[PDB]
Amino acid sequence: VGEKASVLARAAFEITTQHLFAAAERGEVDPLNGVVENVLIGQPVPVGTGIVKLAMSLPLRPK
Amino acid sequence: EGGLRFGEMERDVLIGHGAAMLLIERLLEESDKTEVWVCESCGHLALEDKRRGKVYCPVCGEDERISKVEMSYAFKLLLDELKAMVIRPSLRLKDR
Amino acid sequence: QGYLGEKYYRHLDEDGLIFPESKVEGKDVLVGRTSPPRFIEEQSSLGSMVLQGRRETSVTVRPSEKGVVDKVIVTETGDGTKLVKVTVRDLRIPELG
Amino acid sequence: MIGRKKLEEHYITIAEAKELLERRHAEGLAENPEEPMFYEARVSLEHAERFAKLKPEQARELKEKLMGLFDWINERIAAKLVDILPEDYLDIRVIFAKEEYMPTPEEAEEIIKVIDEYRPLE
Amino acid sequence: KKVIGSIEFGILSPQEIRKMSAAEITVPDTYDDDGYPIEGGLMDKRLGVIDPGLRCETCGARAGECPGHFGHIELARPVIHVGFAKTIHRVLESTCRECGRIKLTDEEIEEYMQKFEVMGDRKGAVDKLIKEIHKKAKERMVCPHCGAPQFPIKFERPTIYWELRKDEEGNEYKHRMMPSEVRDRLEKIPDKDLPLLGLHPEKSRPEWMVLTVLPVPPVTMRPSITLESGIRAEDDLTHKLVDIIRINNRLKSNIEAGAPQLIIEDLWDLLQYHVTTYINNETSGVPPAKHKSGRPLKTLAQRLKGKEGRFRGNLSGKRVNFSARTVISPDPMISINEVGVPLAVAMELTVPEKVTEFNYEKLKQRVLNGPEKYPGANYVIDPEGRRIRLMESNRELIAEKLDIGWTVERHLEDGDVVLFNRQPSLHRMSIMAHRVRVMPYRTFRLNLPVCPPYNADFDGDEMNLHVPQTEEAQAEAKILMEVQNHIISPRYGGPLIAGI
Amino acid sequence: FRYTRFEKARIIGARALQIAMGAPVLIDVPEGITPLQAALLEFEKGVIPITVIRPS
Amino acid sequence: MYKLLKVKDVVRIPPRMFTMDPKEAAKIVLRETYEGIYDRDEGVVLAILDVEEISEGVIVPGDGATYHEAIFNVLVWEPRNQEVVEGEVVEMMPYGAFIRIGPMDGLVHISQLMDDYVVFDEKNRQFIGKETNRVLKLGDYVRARIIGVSVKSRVIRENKINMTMRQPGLGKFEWIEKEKK
Amino acid sequence: RKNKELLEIAQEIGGEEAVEVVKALEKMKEATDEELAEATGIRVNTVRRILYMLNDEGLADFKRIRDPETGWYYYYWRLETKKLPEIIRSRKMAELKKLKEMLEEETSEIYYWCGTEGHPKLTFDEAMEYEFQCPICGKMLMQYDNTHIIEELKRRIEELEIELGL
DNA sequence: TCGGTAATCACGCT
DNA sequence: GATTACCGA
Ligand SMILES: [Mg+2]
Ligand SMILES: [Zn+2]
Ligand SMILES: [Zn+2]
Ligand SMILES: [Zn+2]
Ligand SMILES: [Zn+2]
């Protein structure tokens, strides 16, 4: 957990944050793509059913 | 008159299945949802102003480039507790 | 201002005390309390300047129980005030669980 | 940016855009809301009714012709000359006073000789 | 309809706090008193509304949907921030004073520029690289550009700094460093030396670590709890901010008129002490600033953290809606993947149904019937969004033409997928989507072979169900989580739901 | 070309949400059915329009 | 001056008209998004011409409608800076005059009109010069130059354009021809 | 030379009195607040306040000595002067940033002006809202304004850069 | 070797 | 109050 991840992934583990959360305040970006972040911010997680990609054409006659 | 609370055990027993649609709908849709206006090039929140319409981010004063972002209310308060302390949380948002 | 509801006040007497042996259930009231103004000039919400009334606070049974009252106490405690004690019982046949 | 990208743009005179207004107004003719066009569209139709000075095709033919005479004349300069219809060196001065190139009286008169044609003469 | 791409952190400049803030606060006062609760300081000086009074910064903004706004404090003297202070010492002992350089030769600059991009991916490998630059600048006292002007050695623990300077011949007096003396040194660092430290020239300037302007948090983050009926318990953050302004106020008057020169430096340290508890109360070497009844104050670092803070307490584990919790009691007459549900819990939980074309004959009857008889509805919804509750005085005018597109909320019936839960949630399998059957009493019932997954027994335990609602999250529950898919277990292959 | 268990529970999920927002139904009628149960009957006869993308 | 655009954009087809042909069902969506809306980048978008090509549908988690990537043609009108324009005086005021140059309007104040002291006749609807007896009144075709454009919001109505006519060879068209002799 | 300009800054910050303090302080090079009061002849309270203001501008330092007997910490002030030509430039750098901006604004701004001895030089933003009349005096607004000064100020900037560049 | 300091210690419920 | 381990002479 203390090794490389998102900086929010290290926030909910090792409640230490003025050691750790203010350290990566200096020159640090944070993209995405954990499992603990997208649940924390409101996005679908990548594992499970958020991995499939759909596509569908559209004449769609009922018959 | 309050319900149950779903700890960190109960969040992880749904990720083990593979349910990602249920995990959104349970934790945020049946909870607090707030709609927030956010600037684009500063990253900070905008400020609405009734009686005079027009919304504008103070920091660098823009006019039209501004949108709406859909996020929980407890995450929006996490922005302010990092804002009272001198940390600045710049948001750099993305199209769908 | 701050009305809890209506037709929850069908058991009270004139002064605000339940005459005993009444089937209090749900969120029915027990003692009707009027509170004093609490900031008369902050709001002025288009009719509240003339109304000048009070902000309703009260006591009501916990919103899952039932039962009937047994005895109502009324006295004065040490300083000068007044405090009423009301107790409500229940029958509770042994069903499942 | 409108949408994702802008890839192509062209310059349209008022005589060219008159047909685009009437063909759009030809739809509606849909009759379920009766489709009345919005206010500023109906206002801009009246501006086409008063400045329709030329045929639609002869304005397109002249605008192609003026670009090939000089290299420093683009479509935007040619589309401006259709609305004004210059007659002499007076209008060539006032249009080209805020351009990147101010014409000489030799080269500007050669432009006038081309626009001696396509005149309504009425 | 956008989404969050990336969150980028940094430090607020004192310039940026002024543009963000709407008011300056100079009055240590809350209400004063019992009528017109408006002051010139810490409360609503166009700062944030928490009461049902509509007065805000010209923007209407009733107490529902009013975001608070930030204020600022013009601190008269500079003050060291607590959390950065461990890393300010790393900067000071690794810079050549009076000029602003890095105490390295151009050879090691040109070599260690190239090592940044080679190890340009992993975090742990570049964090070890920044110590050796700190190592080499420590063991030098002769700089290549100033002729060794008697570099002092810094000192720390916790906040007070010193220097080992010589005065007469070889003296070792410890001149205590002032925050005004520190911040003058930090502004002389050029922006190009910042990649050689762990800093960034646009997001983290080092001189912004010394707080010249302290921002004030909004009203909506510091609520006012009412005690009995009219007495208001002041919030712990509010109570310390009131006491900050009274130690500032005199200090402004103290240096503008008073001239004893001794209490000033004594007052100076009170400022430090008093904001240090406000950032993190439980630091070491600092007596905890108590509340005047016997409770220590939970300031910002304890509101963010503390085993019930705001990562596990409120953000990643939240309280939910549409649930219930009661006891369990067997019955071996229902199938393996059904569940009993009491009819009291069944009439206080609802799913949305969205009448399309072929259930229109059904949901006319579910909404005509009231919320009394068990096939019934509670809340109807128009496509605009104005819900119409059904309880009051008529349902006939809503049981008219129901106008395809609406969404009716009716009670649970025999067939709607629910979930179930045990709470100690040890392994993967103690939540499993069942198939509701409704029976009159007050207990959840449960088939006997499904009780080695839950690891339960029937001596008065408690199991909680919670209905899923939206039509994507409900057809996911039925296909992926029903009981019969979980007859064998992922720990050993052998069957788990079996005979007892 | 058999579907997995994660793709089968997403195709039903997207089709049950279209079938509530308009999108006229195939031969699925009888007598009263919640919008989730209409998607289950359509998937059995193999007349789903929605296809997956398999990144490879 | 009008322009013709060719722009791709992402189209959102709802599932109500899910059973129509993709061309005209995407045309009726994309037309009711950009007509009559002033952007700060290009200008007044008047009308959608036609739909050339369309892509496939893609479902996104949460909505259930489909997304497409179409190609369309847009007629815009851009009053850019230092542009020589033509208009019509359709309003008479004592402090200025609204000149309709198309879908938008242009106000010219009384002291950028001409090289003359200008007196407003209060009884009639006209301007009368001091020395010269030229009369500018209602309905007269003029020629001017843009000097200032005030762009504030997305609405056409609340944005106003400043013009001027203090140059040799502007104003009414018959004033220019009769001053040749 | 250069002594005067230092007094000028002190006059801006303190005044005539502060100028007296500096010259007296130069003579002994080290002094306490009390010792200065005897040298000047003006209350130690006023003298000490002057030193506080100069401290914020970075122009005096102090060292602390431990009195062996009573244990009283008394401060010795001194002047520091290895900071003169940097602070003189770095203040005028920011001022020339401010003087770049004024002429830039004016071009992109004020076109209208009221013809009174007060409230002139309004903007089209105001004017449009204000219906092209003044709300303070009611005079009719006028046109293209301050044409002489917007050229002349541009010539003022170039010398100062050259001067500070030296 | 050798002394020193923080930072950590189930689930739910009253 | 107990385990560690990282940090500091
Ligand atoms: Mg048990
Ligand atoms: Zn911004
Ligand atoms: Zn507000
Ligand atoms: Zn150096
Ligand atoms: Zn005036």
Side-chain angles (χ1 to χ4, degrees), chain E residues 96-97 99-101 143 145-146 151:
Chain E
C96 168
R97 66 100 58 83
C99 70
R101 290 292 184 183
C143 140
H145 344 88
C146 326
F151 288 156

XYZ file of all heavy atoms in Angstrom, chain E residues 96-97 99-101 143 145-146 151, ligand 4:
72
model
N 22.595 26.916 -0.498
C 23.613 27.886 -0.120
C 22.964 29.222 0.186
O 22.327 29.817 -0.691
C 24.648 28.068 -1.220
S 25.690 29.484 -0.905
N 23.102 29.677 1.429
C 22.429 30.886 1.874
C 23.027 32.106 1.177
O 24.112 32.043 0.586
C 22.507 31.001 3.403
C 23.903 31.222 3.996
C 24.187 32.679 4.370
N 23.221 33.218 5.327
C 23.289 33.050 6.645
N 24.282 32.358 7.181
N 22.365 33.581 7.431
N 22.664 33.561 -1.551
C 22.642 33.651 -3.009
C 21.478 32.894 -3.627
O 20.773 33.442 -4.482
C 23.954 33.135 -3.617
S 24.174 31.369 -3.484
N 21.249 31.648 -3.214
C 20.088 30.898 -3.658
C 20.370 29.640 -4.462
O 19.438 29.018 -4.974
N 21.631 29.233 -4.570
C 21.986 28.077 -5.386
C 21.731 26.770 -4.639
O 21.045 26.717 -3.616
C 23.433 28.165 -5.861
C 23.683 29.235 -6.889
C 22.972 28.821 -8.162
N 23.205 29.728 -9.276
C 22.639 29.588 -10.468
N 21.808 28.578 -10.693
N 22.900 30.455 -11.434
N 30.896 26.817 -0.543
C 30.145 26.750 -1.786
C 31.030 27.192 -2.953
O 31.989 27.946 -2.760
C 28.884 27.621 -1.678
S 28.364 28.606 -3.112
N 30.498 29.387 -5.164
C 30.169 30.698 -5.710
C 30.170 31.821 -4.682
O 29.908 32.968 -5.055
C 28.791 30.667 -6.398
C 28.289 29.287 -6.683
N 27.563 28.556 -5.769
C 28.444 28.489 -7.765
C 27.272 27.375 -6.283
N 27.795 27.309 -7.493
N 30.452 31.541 -3.406
C 30.425 32.570 -2.376
C 31.595 32.498 -1.406
O 31.627 33.290 -0.460
C 29.110 32.538 -1.570
S 27.609 32.072 -2.459
N 28.713 28.901 6.979
C 27.388 28.293 6.952
C 26.984 27.766 8.325
O 27.720 26.969 8.922
C 27.361 27.148 5.949
C 27.405 27.593 4.530
C 27.876 26.741 3.547
C 26.990 28.864 4.178
C 27.926 27.145 2.237
C 27.026 29.271 2.872
C 27.505 28.412 1.899
Zn 26.333 30.066 -3.252
